[PDB]
PDB file of C-alpha atoms in Angstrom:
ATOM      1  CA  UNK A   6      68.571  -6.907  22.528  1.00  0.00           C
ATOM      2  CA  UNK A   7      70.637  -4.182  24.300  1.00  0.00           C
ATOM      3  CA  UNK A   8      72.086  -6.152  27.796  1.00  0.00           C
ATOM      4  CA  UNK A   9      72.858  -8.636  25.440  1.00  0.00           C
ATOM      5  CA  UNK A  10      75.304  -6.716  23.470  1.00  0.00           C
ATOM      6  CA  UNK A  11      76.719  -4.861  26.444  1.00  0.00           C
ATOM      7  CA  UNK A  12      77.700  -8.516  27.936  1.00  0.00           C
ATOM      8  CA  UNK A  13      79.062  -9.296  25.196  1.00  0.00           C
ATOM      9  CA  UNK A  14      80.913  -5.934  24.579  1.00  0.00           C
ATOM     10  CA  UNK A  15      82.091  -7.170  27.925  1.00  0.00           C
ATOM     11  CA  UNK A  16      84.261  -9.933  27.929  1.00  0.00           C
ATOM     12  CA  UNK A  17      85.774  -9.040  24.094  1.00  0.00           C
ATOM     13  CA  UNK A  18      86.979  -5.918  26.082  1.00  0.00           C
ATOM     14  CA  UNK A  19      88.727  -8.198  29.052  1.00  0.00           C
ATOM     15  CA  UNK A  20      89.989 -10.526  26.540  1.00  0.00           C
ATOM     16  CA  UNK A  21      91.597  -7.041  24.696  1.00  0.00           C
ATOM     17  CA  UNK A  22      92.843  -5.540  27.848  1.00  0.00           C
ATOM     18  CA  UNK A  23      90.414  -2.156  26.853  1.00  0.00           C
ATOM     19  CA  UNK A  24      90.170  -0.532  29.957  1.00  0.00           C
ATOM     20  CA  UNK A  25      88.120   2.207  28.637  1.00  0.00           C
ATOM     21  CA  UNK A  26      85.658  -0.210  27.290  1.00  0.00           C
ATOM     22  CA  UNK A  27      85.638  -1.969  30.528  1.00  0.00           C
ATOM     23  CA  UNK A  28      84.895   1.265  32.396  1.00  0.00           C
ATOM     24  CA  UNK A  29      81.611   2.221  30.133  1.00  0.00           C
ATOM     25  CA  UNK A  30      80.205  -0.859  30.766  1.00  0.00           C
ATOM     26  CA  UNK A  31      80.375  -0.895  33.987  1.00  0.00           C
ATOM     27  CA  UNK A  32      79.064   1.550  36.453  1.00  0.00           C
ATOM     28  CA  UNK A  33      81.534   2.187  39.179  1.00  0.00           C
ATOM     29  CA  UNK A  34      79.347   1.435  41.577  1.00  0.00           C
ATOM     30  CA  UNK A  35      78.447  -1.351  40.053  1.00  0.00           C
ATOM     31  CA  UNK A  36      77.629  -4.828  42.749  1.00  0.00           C
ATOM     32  CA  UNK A  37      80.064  -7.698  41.556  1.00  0.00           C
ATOM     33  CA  UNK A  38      79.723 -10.606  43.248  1.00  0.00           C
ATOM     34  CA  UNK A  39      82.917 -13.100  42.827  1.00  0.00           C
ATOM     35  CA  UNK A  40      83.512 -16.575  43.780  1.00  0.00           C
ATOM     36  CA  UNK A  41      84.989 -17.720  47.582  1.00  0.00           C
ATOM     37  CA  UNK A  42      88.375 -18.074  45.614  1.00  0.00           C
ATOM     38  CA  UNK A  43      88.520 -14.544  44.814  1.00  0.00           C
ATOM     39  CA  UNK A  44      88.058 -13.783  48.290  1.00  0.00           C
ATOM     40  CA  UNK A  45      91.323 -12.060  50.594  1.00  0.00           C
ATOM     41  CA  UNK A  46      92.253 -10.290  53.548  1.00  0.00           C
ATOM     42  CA  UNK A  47      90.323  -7.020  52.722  1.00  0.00           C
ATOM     43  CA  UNK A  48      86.974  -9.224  51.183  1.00  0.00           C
ATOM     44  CA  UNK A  49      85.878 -12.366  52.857  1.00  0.00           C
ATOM     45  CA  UNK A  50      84.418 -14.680  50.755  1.00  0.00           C
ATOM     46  CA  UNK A  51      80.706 -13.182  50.153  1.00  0.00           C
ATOM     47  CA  UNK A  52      81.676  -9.912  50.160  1.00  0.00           C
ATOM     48  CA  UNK A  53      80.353  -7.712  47.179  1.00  0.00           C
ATOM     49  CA  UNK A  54      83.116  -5.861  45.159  1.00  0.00           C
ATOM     50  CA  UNK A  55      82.648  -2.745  43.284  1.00  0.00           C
ATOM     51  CA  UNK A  56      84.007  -2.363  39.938  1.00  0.00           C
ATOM     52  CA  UNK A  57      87.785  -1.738  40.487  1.00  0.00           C
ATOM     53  CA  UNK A  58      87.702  -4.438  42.620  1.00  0.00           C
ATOM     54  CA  UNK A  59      86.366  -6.649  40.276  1.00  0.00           C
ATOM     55  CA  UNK A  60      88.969  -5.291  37.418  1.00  0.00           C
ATOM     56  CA  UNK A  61      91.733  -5.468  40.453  1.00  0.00           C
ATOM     57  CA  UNK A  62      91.031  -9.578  40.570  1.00  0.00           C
ATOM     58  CA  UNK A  63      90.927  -9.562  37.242  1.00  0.00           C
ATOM     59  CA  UNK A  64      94.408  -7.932  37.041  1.00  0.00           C
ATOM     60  CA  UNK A  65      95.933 -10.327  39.446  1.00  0.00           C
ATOM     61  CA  UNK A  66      94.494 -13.751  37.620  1.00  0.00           C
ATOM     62  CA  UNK A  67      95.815 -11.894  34.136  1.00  0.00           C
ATOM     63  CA  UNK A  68      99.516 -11.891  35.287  1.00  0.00           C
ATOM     64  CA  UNK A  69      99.101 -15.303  36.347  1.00  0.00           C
ATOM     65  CA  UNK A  70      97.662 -16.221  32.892  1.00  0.00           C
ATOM     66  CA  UNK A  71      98.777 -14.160  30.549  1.00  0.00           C
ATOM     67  CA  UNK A  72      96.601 -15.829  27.779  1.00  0.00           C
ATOM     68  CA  UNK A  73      93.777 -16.607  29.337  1.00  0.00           C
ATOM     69  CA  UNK A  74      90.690 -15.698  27.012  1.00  0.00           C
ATOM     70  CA  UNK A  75      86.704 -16.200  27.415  1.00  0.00           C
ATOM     71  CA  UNK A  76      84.762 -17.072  25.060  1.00  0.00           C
ATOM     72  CA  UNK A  77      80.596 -16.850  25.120  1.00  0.00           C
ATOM     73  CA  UNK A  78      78.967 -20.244  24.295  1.00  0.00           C
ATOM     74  CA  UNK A  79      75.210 -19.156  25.245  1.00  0.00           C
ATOM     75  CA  UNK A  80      73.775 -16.167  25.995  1.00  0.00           C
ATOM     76  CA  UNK A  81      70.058 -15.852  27.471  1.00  0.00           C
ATOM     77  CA  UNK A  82      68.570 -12.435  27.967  1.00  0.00           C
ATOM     78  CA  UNK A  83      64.882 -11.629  29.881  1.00  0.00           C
ATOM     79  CA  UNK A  84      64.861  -7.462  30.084  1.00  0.00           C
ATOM     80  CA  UNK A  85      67.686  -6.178  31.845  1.00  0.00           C
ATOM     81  CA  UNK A  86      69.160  -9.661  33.415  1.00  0.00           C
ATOM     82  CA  UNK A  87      71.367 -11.560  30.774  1.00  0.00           C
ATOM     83  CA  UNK A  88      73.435 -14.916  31.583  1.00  0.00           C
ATOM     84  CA  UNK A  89      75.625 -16.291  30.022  1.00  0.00           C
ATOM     85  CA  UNK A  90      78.348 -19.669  30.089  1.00  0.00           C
ATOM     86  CA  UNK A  91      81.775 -18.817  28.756  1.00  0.00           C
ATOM     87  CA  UNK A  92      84.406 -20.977  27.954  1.00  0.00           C
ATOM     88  CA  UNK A  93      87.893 -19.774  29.667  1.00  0.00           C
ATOM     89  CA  UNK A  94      90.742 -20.850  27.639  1.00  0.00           C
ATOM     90  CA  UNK A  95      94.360 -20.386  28.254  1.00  0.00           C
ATOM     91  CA  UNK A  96      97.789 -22.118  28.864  1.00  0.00           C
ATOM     92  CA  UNK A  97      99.667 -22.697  31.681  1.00  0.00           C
ATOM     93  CA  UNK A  98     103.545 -22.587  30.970  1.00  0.00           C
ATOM     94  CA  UNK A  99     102.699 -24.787  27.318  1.00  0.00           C
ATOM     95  CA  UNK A 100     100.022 -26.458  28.507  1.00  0.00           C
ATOM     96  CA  UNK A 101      96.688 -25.815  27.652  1.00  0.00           C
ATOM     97  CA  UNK A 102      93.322 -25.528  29.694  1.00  0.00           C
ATOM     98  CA  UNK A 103      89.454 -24.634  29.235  1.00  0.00           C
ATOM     99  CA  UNK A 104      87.315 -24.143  31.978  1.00  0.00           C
ATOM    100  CA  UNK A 105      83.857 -23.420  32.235  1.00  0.00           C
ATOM    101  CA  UNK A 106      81.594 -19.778  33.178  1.00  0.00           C
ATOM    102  CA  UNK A 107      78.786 -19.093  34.421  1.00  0.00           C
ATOM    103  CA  UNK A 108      77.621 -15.420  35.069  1.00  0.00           C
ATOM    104  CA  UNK A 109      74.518 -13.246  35.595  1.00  0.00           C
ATOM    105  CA  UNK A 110      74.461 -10.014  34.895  1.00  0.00           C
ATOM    106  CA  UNK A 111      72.132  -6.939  35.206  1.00  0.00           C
ATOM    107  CA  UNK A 112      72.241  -4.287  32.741  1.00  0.00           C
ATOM    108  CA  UNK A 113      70.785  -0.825  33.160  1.00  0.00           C
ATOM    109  CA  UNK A 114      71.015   2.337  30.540  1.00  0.00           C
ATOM    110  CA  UNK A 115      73.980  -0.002  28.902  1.00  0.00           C
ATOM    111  CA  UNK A 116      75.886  -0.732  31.738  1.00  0.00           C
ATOM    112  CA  UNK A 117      76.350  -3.348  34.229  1.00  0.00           C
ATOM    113  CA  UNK A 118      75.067  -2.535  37.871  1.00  0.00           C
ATOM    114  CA  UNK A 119      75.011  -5.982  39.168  1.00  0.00           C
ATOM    115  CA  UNK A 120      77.094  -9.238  38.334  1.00  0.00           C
ATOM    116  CA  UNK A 121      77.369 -12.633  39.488  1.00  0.00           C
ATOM    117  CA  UNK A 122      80.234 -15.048  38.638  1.00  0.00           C
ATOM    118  CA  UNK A 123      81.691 -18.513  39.376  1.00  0.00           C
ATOM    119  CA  UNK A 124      84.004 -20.883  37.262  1.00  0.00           C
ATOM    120  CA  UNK A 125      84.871 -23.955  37.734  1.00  0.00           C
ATOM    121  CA  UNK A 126      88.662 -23.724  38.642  1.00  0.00           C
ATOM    122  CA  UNK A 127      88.602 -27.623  39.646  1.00  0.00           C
ATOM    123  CA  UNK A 128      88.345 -28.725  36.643  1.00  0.00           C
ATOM    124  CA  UNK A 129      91.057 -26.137  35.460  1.00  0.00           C
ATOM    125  CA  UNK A 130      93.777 -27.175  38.103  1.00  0.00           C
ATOM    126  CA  UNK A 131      92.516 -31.158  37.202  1.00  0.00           C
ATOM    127  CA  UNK A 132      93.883 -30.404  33.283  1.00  0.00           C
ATOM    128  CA  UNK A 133      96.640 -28.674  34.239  1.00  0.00           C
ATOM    129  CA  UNK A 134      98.155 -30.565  37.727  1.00  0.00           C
TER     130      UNK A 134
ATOM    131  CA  UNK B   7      57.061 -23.710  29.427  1.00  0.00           C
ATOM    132  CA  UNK B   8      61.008 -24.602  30.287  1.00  0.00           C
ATOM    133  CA  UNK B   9      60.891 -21.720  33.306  1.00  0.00           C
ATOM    134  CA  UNK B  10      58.331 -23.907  34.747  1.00  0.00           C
ATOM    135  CA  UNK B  11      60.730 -27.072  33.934  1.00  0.00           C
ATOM    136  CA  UNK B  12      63.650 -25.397  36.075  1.00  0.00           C
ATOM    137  CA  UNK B  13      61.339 -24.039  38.757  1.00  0.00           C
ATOM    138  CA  UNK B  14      59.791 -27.352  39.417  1.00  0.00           C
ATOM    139  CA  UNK B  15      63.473 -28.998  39.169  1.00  0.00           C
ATOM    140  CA  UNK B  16      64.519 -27.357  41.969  1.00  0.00           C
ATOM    141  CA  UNK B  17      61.506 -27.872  44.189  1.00  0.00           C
ATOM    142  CA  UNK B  18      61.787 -31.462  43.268  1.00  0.00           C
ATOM    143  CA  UNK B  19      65.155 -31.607  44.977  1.00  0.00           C
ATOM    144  CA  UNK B  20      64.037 -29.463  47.893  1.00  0.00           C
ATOM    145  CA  UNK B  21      61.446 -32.092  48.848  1.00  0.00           C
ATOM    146  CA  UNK B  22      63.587 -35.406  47.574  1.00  0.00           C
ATOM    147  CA  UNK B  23      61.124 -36.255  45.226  1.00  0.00           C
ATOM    148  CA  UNK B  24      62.582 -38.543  42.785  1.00  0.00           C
ATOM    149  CA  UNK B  25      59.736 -39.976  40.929  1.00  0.00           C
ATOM    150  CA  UNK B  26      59.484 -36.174  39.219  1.00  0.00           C
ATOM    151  CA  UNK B  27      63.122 -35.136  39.212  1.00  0.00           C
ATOM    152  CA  UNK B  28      63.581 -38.625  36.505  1.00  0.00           C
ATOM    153  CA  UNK B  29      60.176 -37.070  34.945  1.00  0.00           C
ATOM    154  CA  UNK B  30      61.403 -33.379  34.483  1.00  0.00           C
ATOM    155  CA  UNK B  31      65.374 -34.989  33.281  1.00  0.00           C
ATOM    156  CA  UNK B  32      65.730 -36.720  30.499  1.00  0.00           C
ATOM    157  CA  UNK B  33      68.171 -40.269  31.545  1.00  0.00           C
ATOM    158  CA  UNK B  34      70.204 -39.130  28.605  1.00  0.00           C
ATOM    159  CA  UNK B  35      70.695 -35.552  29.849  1.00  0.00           C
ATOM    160  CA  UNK B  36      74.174 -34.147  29.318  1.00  0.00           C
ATOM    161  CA  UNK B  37      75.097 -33.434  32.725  1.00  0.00           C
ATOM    162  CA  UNK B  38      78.041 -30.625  33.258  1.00  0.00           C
ATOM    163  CA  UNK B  39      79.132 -30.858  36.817  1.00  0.00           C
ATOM    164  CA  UNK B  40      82.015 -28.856  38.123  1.00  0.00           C
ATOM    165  CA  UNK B  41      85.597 -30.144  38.691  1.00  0.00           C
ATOM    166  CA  UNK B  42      84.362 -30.755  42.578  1.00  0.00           C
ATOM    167  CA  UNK B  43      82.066 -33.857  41.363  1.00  0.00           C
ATOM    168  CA  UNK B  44      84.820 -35.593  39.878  1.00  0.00           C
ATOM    169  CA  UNK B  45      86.183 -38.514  41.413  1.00  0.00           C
ATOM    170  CA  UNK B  46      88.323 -41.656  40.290  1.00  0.00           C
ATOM    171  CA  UNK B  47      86.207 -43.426  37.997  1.00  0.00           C
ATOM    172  CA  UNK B  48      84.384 -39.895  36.605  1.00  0.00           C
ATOM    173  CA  UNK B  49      87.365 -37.321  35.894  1.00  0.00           C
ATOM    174  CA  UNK B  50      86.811 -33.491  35.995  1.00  0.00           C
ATOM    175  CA  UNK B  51      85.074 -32.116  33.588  1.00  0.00           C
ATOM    176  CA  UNK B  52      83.343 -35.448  32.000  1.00  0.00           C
ATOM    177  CA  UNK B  53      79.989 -35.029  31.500  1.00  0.00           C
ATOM    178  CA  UNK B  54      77.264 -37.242  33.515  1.00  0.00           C
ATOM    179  CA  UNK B  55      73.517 -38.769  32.562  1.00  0.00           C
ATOM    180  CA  UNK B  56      70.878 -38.090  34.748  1.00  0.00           C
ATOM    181  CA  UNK B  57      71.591 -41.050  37.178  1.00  0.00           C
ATOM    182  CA  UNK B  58      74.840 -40.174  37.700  1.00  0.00           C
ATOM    183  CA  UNK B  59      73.986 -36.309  38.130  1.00  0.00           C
ATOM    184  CA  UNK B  60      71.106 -37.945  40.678  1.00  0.00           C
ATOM    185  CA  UNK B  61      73.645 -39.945  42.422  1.00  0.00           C
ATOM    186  CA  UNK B  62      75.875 -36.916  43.416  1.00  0.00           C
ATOM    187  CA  UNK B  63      73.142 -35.073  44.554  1.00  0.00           C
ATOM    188  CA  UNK B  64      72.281 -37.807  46.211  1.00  0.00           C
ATOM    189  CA  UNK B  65      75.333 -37.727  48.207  1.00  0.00           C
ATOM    190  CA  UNK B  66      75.166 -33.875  48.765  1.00  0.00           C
ATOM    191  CA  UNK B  67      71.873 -33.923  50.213  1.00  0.00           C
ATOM    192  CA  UNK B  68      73.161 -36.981  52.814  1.00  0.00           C
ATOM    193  CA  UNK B  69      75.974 -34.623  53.914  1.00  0.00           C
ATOM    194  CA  UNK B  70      74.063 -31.150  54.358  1.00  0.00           C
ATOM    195  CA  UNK B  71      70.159 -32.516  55.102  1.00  0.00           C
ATOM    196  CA  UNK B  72      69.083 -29.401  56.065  1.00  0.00           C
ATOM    197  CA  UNK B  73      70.183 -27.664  52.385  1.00  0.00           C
ATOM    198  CA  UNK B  74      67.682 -26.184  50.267  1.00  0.00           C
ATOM    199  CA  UNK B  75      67.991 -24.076  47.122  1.00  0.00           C
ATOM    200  CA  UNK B  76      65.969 -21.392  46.114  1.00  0.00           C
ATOM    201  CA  UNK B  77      65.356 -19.598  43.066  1.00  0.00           C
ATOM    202  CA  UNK B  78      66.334 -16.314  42.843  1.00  0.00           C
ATOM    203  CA  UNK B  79      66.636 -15.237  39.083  1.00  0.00           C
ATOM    204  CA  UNK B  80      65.589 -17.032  36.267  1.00  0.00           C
ATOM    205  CA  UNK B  81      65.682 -16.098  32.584  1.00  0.00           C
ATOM    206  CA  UNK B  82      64.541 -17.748  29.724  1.00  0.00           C
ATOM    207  CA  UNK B  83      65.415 -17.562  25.248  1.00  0.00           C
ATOM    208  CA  UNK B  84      63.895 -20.265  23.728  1.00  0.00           C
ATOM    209  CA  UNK B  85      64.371 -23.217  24.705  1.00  0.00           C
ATOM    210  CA  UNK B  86      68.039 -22.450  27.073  1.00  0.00           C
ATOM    211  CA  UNK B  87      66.794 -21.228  30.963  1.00  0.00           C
ATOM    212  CA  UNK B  88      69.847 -20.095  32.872  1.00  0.00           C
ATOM    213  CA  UNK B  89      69.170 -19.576  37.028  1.00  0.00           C
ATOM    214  CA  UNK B  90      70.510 -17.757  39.969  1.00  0.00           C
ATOM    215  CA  UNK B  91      70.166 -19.899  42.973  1.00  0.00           C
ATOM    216  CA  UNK B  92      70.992 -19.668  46.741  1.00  0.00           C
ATOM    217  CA  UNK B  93      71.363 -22.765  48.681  1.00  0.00           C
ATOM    218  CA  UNK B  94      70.606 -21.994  52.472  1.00  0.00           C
ATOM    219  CA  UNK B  95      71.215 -24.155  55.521  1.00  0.00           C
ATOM    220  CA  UNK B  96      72.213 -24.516  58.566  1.00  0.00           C
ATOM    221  CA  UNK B  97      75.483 -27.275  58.986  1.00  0.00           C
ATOM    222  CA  UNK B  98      76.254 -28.165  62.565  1.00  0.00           C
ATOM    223  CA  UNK B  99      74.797 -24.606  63.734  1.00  0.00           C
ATOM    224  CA  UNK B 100      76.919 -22.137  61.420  1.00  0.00           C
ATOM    225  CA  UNK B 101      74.577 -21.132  59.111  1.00  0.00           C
ATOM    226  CA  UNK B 102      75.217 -20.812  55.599  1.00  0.00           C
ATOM    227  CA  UNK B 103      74.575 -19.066  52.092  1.00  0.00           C
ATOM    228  CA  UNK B 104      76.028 -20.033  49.031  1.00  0.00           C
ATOM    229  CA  UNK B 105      75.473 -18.896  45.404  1.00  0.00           C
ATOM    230  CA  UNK B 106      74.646 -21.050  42.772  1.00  0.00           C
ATOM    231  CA  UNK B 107      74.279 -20.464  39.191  1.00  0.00           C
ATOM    232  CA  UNK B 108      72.762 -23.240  36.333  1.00  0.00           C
ATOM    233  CA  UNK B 109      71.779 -23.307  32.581  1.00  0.00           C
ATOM    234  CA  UNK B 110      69.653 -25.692  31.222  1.00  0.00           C
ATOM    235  CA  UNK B 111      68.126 -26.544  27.895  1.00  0.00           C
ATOM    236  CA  UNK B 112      64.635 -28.061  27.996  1.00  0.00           C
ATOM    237  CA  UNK B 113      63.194 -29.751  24.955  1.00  0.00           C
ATOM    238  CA  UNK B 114      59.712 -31.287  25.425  1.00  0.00           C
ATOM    239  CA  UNK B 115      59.539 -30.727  29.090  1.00  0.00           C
ATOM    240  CA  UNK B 116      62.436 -32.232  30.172  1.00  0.00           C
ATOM    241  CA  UNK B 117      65.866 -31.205  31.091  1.00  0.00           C
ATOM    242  CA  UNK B 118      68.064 -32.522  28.248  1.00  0.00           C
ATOM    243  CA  UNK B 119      71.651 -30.618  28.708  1.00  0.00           C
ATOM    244  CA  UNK B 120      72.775 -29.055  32.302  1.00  0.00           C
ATOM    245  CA  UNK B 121      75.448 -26.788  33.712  1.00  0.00           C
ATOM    246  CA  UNK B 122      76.048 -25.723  37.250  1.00  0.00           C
ATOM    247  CA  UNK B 123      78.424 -24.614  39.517  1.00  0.00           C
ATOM    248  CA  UNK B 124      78.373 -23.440  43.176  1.00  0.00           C
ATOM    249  CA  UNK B 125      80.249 -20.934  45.197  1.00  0.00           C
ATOM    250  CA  UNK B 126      82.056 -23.777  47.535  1.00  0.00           C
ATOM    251  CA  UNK B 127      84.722 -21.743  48.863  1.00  0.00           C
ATOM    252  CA  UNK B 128      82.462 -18.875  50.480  1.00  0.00           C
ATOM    253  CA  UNK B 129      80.460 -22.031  51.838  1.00  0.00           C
ATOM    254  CA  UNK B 130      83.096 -23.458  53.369  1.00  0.00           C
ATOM    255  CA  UNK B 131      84.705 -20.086  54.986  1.00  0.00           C
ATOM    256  CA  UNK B 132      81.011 -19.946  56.343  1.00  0.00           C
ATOM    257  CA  UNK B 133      81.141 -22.831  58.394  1.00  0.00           C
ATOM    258  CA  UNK B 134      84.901 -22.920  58.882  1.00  0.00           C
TER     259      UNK B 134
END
């Protein structure tokens, strides 16, 4: 039940702001696939990220919400590849929001090499206006 | 087994085949659609039933007839199978490739509690 614990190791360290943490569990050249909505100028939507691109976006949404915390609601592990569904809460200027997580993950030696996230921001922006 | 459940799911939808999608969901299912499904009478982030769940796909399939969605990843703890999808078609002539990912608890065969969401955006920047 290692990839299980690194995942999870995971997202206490981006709710903590632990960069270190965040950089041992996650090879540099680690393939992080975000969501359209996380796409720019430099990625098009698609586009794989390595991991300081992936903790760049994550910068970026984190001075937007300065709050913003996941939590893991189920976790599912088959030998390296663990999922998971994460609840994202936070507030916007007083008022608050959850959103669902999904993610896929791939875990070798204790650290992530490949990742796949979405959320559901719709809902988000619905509770929030 | 519930990997089976999920795999035959999703080939059920591929071919339109409704008489074993409404064996393999319960009508009771707790259906977790993303923010996109809402609509007046069903608001963001209110859970569905399986006929309601049916009736958006339903809608989906209608718009992009061409769409299927594969199985890519699938992993499986007890009775919870979570899935990394890729729904493929071809809209108009732009092709597309969009990322889907699911959980699913299976009790008895059947799909009793679902979440999904898909990667909209990068479809959409696909086709235009």
């Amino acid at each position: 039940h290692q990839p299980s614990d690194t995942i999870a190791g995971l997202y206490e360290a981006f709710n903590s702001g632990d960069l270190e943490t965040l950089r041992e569990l996650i090879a540099p050249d680690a393939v992080i696939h975000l969501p359209g909505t996380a796409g720019d100028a430099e990625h098009p939507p698609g586009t794989p990220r390595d991991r300081e691109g992936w903790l760049g976006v994550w910068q970026f949404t984190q001075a937007f919400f300065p709050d913003m915390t996941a939590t893991v609601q189920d976790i599912v592990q088959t030998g390296d590849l663990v999922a998971t569904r994460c609840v994202a809460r936070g507030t916007h200027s007083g008022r608050p929001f959850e959103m669902t997580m999904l993610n896929m993950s791939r875990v070798r030696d204790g650290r992530i090499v490949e990742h796949w996230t979405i959320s559901d921001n719709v809902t988000m922006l619905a509770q929030l206006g």
